[PDB]
Design an enzyme around this catalytic site. Structure first.
Site, PDB file in Angstrom:
ATOM      1  N   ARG A   1      -1.301  17.525  46.518  1.00  0.00           N
ATOM      2  CA  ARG A   1      -1.869  17.598  45.208  1.00  0.00           C
ATOM      3  C   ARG A   1      -2.870  16.662  44.512  1.00  0.00           C
ATOM      4  NH1 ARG A   1      -2.122  23.236  44.760  1.00  0.00           N
ATOM      5  NH2 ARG A   1      -0.284  24.266  43.924  1.00  0.00           N
TER       6      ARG A   1
ATOM      7  N   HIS B   1       5.680  19.321  31.391  1.00  0.00           N
ATOM      8  CA  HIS B   1       5.324  20.736  31.845  1.00  0.00           C
ATOM      9  C   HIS B   1       4.747  21.518  30.864  1.00  0.00           C
ATOM     10  CE1 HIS B   1       7.777  21.399  35.769  1.00  0.00           C
ATOM     11  NE2 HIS B   1       7.519  20.107  35.676  1.00  0.00           N
TER      12      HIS B   1
HETATM   13  C1  HEM Z   1      14.601  20.420  37.799  1.00  0.00           C
HETATM   14  C2  HEM Z   1      13.216  20.046  36.931  1.00  0.00           C
HETATM   15  C3  HEM Z   1      11.947  20.314  37.407  1.00  0.00           C
HETATM   16  C4  HEM Z   1      11.602  20.969  38.308  1.00  0.00           C
HETATM   17  C5  HEM Z   1      12.293  22.477  38.886  1.00  0.00           C
HETATM   18  C6  HEM Z   1      10.303  20.991  38.535  1.00  0.00           C
HETATM   19  C7  HEM Z   1       9.348  21.619  39.324  1.00  0.00           C
HETATM   20  C8  HEM Z   1       7.868  21.598  39.364  1.00  0.00           C
HETATM   21  C9  HEM Z   1       7.120  22.375  40.047  1.00  0.00           C
HETATM   22  C10 HEM Z   1       7.365  23.777  40.854  1.00  0.00           C
HETATM   23  C11 HEM Z   1       5.778  22.143  39.871  1.00  0.00           C
HETATM   24  C12 HEM Z   1       4.193  22.584  40.560  1.00  0.00           C
HETATM   25  C13 HEM Z   1       3.887  22.073  41.587  1.00  0.00           C
HETATM   26  C14 HEM Z   1       2.667  22.666  42.060  1.00  0.00           C
HETATM   27  O1  HEM Z   1       2.517  23.815  42.438  1.00  0.00           O
HETATM   28  O2  HEM Z   1       1.589  21.752  42.054  1.00  0.00           O
HETATM   29  C15 HEM Z   1       5.784  21.035  38.875  1.00  0.00           C
HETATM   30  C16 HEM Z   1       4.391  20.121  38.444  1.00  0.00           C
HETATM   31  C17 HEM Z   1       4.596  19.014  37.780  1.00  0.00           C
HETATM   32  N1  HEM Z   1       5.892  18.239  37.342  1.00  0.00           N
HETATM   33 FE1  HEM Z   1       7.771  19.073  37.421  1.00  0.00          FE
HETATM   34  N2  HEM Z   1       9.849  19.904  37.850  1.00  0.00           N
HETATM   35  C18 HEM Z   1      10.794  19.307  37.047  1.00  0.00           C
HETATM   36  C19 HEM Z   1      11.160  18.118  36.296  1.00  0.00           C
HETATM   37  C20 HEM Z   1       9.821  17.409  36.181  1.00  0.00           C
HETATM   38  C21 HEM Z   1       9.954  16.016  35.361  1.00  0.00           C
HETATM   39  C22 HEM Z   1      11.407  15.454  35.123  1.00  0.00           C
HETATM   40  C23 HEM Z   1       8.816  15.395  35.427  1.00  0.00           C
HETATM   41  C24 HEM Z   1       8.223  14.070  34.708  1.00  0.00           C
HETATM   42  C25 HEM Z   1       7.595  14.165  33.947  1.00  0.00           C
HETATM   43  C26 HEM Z   1       7.842  16.289  35.949  1.00  0.00           C
HETATM   44  C27 HEM Z   1       6.637  16.433  36.044  1.00  0.00           C
HETATM   45  C28 HEM Z   1       5.495  17.078  36.576  1.00  0.00           C
HETATM   46  C29 HEM Z   1       4.184  16.988  36.657  1.00  0.00           C
HETATM   47  C30 HEM Z   1       3.303  15.840  36.286  1.00  0.00           C
HETATM   48  C31 HEM Z   1       3.670  17.847  37.532  1.00  0.00           C
HETATM   49  C32 HEM Z   1       1.956  18.405  37.868  1.00  0.00           C
HETATM   50  C33 HEM Z   1       1.441  19.438  36.681  1.00  0.00           C
HETATM   51  C34 HEM Z   1       0.178  19.644  37.038  1.00  0.00           C
HETATM   52  O3  HEM Z   1      -0.229  20.119  38.312  1.00  0.00           O
HETATM   53  O4  HEM Z   1      -0.671  20.010  36.033  1.00  0.00           O
HETATM   54  N3  HEM Z   1       8.697  17.549  36.362  1.00  0.00           N
HETATM   55  N4  HEM Z   1       6.969  20.453  38.835  1.00  0.00           N
END
Ligand code: HEM
Ligand SMILES: CCCCCCCCCCO[C@@H]1O[C@H](CO)[C@@H](O[C@H]2O[C@H](CO)[C@@H](O)[C@H](O)[C@H]2O)[C@H](O)[C@H]1O
Ligand SMILES: [Ca+2]
Ligand SMILES: [Cl-]
Ligand SMILES: [Cl-]
Ligand SMILES: [Cl-]
Ligand SMILES: [Cl-]
Ligand code: NA
Ligand code: NA
EC number: 1.13.11.92
Length: 611
Positions: A472, A150
């Site tokens: 996405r 993130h």
């Molecule tokens: C409770 C914990 C977490 C929450 C609440 C959360 C929530 C989110 C949200 C809301 C998005 C944006 C979705 C969008 O608008 O496209 C996102 C993107 C992302 N998250 Fe998480 N996430 C969590 C944990 C994690 C974990 C453990 C990983 C593992 C590495 C991760 C990896 C990613 C990746 C690769 C993206 C895409 C970023 C981008 O589009 O540039 N997240 N997450």
């Protein structure tokens, strides 16, 4: 036929030297053997595969002729916006720049909703029976990778909104019946090759921005402006703004687990400030800040490289590979005593005489985002444990209560954390396995999640994250699973049976995708793919890691040309050299719970692991 038919065309166009490397790796791949041989051969395989990827899988997005001229000796520190790292390219790796690509885009504008994202989310992703990693990887490890990811990458959004609606067939099973979201911003490249790109609003460099900030308004407001230090609460937790948003490096969409890591590394940075000031009593606030940022960012990269990744990929070959990237194949003893010897293999990527971007301006890539989509790592509930309780029947700190992890997410999560405290939260996370990256393991609380604005505040439109992720990858023209494999010189599946031996998975995939293996979504494939023994991730995802994890070290001036005592200070460099993993950092600031409860060598293992 020697070469797989789908790889014959590219093979025919290879130089003689690339032909040799390809035939070598392909000989193992056809028999699924690379991970089944002794370490030295495994390493030769990995280096050979890496060289090929570096040549064929680094694609510029936007004009590479970035002229902006500067003297590297004028910027001997990591800048707030990530500029002025690459001596030939002031813009490389800075915020608000194009994501590069590892593969040519695949236009999916006519198939964005095929098959339906809610159907995929509901039938293939939604957590059924909970699956965990055993002892291999704990909740601190899950928090770590978000703390990384993130921070590393965040796609710029369009200001407008679109919405999708759950179809009749699955609506009764969807926590949300429809949701709105912002499209990924498309920007013209004005270039010869790829015409459209997306922006990373974070820096691509290993620069600790999760702790130092993204923006000129908090980046400032995070600092005490005395002795180079950063702001932290008296309980050892992050401070908070009146709106409830954490005072740290602008990580949106966070949870309590990430917050404690930010807090821990704030204390790390501050302790580095103390140590450097003791060596150099006359340094200004700004000088101390700069040196401590260099030190802390390198500690983070090091912990990720030789600790986190080593437990993620729990094989002998991968321990050797990751340590070789950092220390070199000659090893830590030689590296620490004599410095970098030989080239990238013998001496390592860290400490190379010059950064190397392999002919392509440094950036993070669209595909690096896709393979790091690991939301299934989050467990449904956290077992809170007593840091001073009597050892239970399993010799663990005794359980006090189960908490729904949904209650520990976002702004409300910051509130709950303020009632739990660092030691209890950290210990509890250390003693529990995280979720496995498999099908049917995506947490329900992600399926009606409040997402956040850039400033960390709540948006009124909840999302089904699982449905959105699938959307996405398609929206951003990332090749689907099978083509994705082909582009990395991996053998494609012919049928579902090649993907997995799980009969239920096959039948469910068939119901949704038919027998069209080209339709299978990347995320679904990455989760379902049969895993190498010891690997928490798919081999497909790992292939992007081979390339990109190496690149993030090798392309960085501050891990190569300027990885020295002059740039970091002597005490600063010693701090990096003597820190081997998260255990070392936790022990520095919380030696009591470490001595009492951390039995495993790695703080990323479930803490009672017998190794
Ligand atoms: C409770 C914990 C977490 C929450 C609440 C959360 C929530 C989110 C949200 C809301 C998005 C944006 C979705 C969008 O608008 O496209 C996102 C993107 C992302 N998250 Fe998480 N996430 C969590 C944990 C994690 C974990 C453990 C990983 C593992 C590495 C991760 C990896 C990613 C990746 C690769 C993206 C895409 C970023 C981008 O589009 O540039 N997240 N997450
Ligand atoms: C230890 C001593 C070393 C001995 C010298 C080694 C010299 C070989 C290096 C280059 O190898 C050639 O590379 C060409 C491509 O660069 C290949 O062309 C292939 O690919 C081209 C484009 O990719 C096509 O235009 C050609 O038709 C097609 O033959 C060609 O086959 C291959 O032999
Ligand atoms: Ca960064
Ligand atoms: Cl070593
Ligand atoms: Cl070498
Ligand atoms: Cl990585
Ligand atoms: Cl080191
Ligand atoms: Na197979
Ligand atoms: Na040990």
């Amino acid at each position: 036929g020697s070469v797989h038919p789908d790889l014959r065309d590219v093979f025919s166009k290879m130089s003689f030297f690339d032909k040799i490397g390809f035939l070598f790796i392909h000989a193992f791949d056809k028999r699924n053997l690379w991970h089944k041989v002794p370490v030295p051969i495994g390493l030769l395989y990995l280096n050979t595969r890496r060289t090929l990827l570096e040549k064929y899988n680094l694609l510029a997005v936007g004009r590479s002729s970035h002229g902006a001229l500067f003297d590297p000796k004028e910027f001997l520190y990591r800048t707030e916006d990530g500029k002025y790292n690459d001596p030939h390219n002031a813009e490389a790796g800075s915020q608000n720049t194009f994501f590069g690509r590892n593969m040519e885009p695949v236009d999916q504008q006519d198939e964005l909703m095929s098959p339906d994202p809610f159907v995929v989310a509901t039938k293939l992703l939604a957590r059924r029976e909970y699956k965990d990693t055993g002892k291999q990887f704990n909740i601190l490890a899950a928090a770590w990778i978000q703390f990384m990811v993130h921070d590393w990458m965040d796609h710029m959004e369009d200001t407008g909104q679109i919405g999708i609606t759950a179809p009749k067939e699955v609506a009764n099973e969807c926590p949300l019946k429809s949701f709105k979201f912002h499209p990924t911003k498309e920007l013209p490249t004005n270039s010869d090759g790829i015409k459209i790109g997306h922006y990373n609003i974070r820096t691509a460099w290993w620069d600790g921005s999760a702790v130092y900030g993204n923006n000129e308004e908090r980046a400032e407001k995070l600092r005490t402006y005395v002795d180079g230090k950063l702001v932290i609460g008296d309980d050892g937790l992050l401070l908070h703004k009146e709106n409830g948003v954490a005072l740290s490096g602008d990580i949106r969409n966070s949870w309590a687990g990430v917050s404690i890591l930010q807090a821990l590394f704030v204390k790390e940075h501050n302790a580095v400030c103390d140590a450097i000031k003791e060596e150099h009593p006359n340094l200004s606030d700004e000088e101390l800040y700069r040196y401590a940022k260099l030190v802390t960012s390198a500690v983070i990269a090091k912990v990720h490289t030789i600790d986190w990744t080593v437990e993620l990929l729990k094989t002998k070959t991968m321990r050797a590979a990751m340590r070789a990237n950092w220390y070199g194949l000659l090893g830590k003893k030689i590296k620490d005593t004599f410095g970098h010897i030989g080239g990238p293999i013998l001496g390592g990527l860290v400490g190379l005489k010059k950064p190397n971007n392999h002919g392509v301006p440094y950036s993070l890539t669209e595909e690096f985002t896709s393979v790091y989509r690991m939301h299934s790592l989050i467990p449904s509930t956290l077992k809170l444990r007593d840091p001073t309780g009597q050892p239970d029947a399993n010799n663990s700190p005794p359980c006090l209560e189960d908490i729904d992890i949904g209650e520990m997410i976002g702004l409300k999560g910051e509130e709950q954390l303020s009632k739990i405290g660092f030691e209890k939260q950290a210990l509890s996370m250390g003693y529990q396995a995280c979720g496995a990256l498999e099908l049917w393991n995506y947490p329900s609380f992600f399926r009606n999640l409040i997402p956040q604005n850039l400033d960390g505040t709540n948006r009124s439109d909840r999302i089904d994250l699982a449905a959105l992720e699938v959307y996405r990858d398609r929206e951003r023209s990332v090749p689907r699973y099978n083509e994705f494999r082909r582009r990395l010189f991996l053998i494609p599946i012919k049928s579902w049976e090649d993907l997995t031996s799980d009969k239920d998975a096959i039948e469910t995939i068939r119901a949704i995708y038919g027998d069209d293996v080209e339709k299978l979504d990347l995320l679904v494939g990455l989760m379902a793919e049969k895993k190498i023994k010891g690997f928490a991730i798919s081999e497909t995802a790992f292939n992007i890691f081979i390339l990109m994890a190496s690149r993030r070290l090798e392309a960085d001036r501050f891990f190569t040309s300027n990885f020295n005592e002059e740039t970091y200070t002597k005490k600063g460099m010693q701090w990096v050299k003597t820190t081997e993993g998260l255990r070392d950092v936790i022990n520095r600031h919380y030696p009591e719970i470490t001595a009492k409860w951390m039995k495993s060598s790695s703080a990323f293992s479930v803490w009672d692991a017998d190794y």
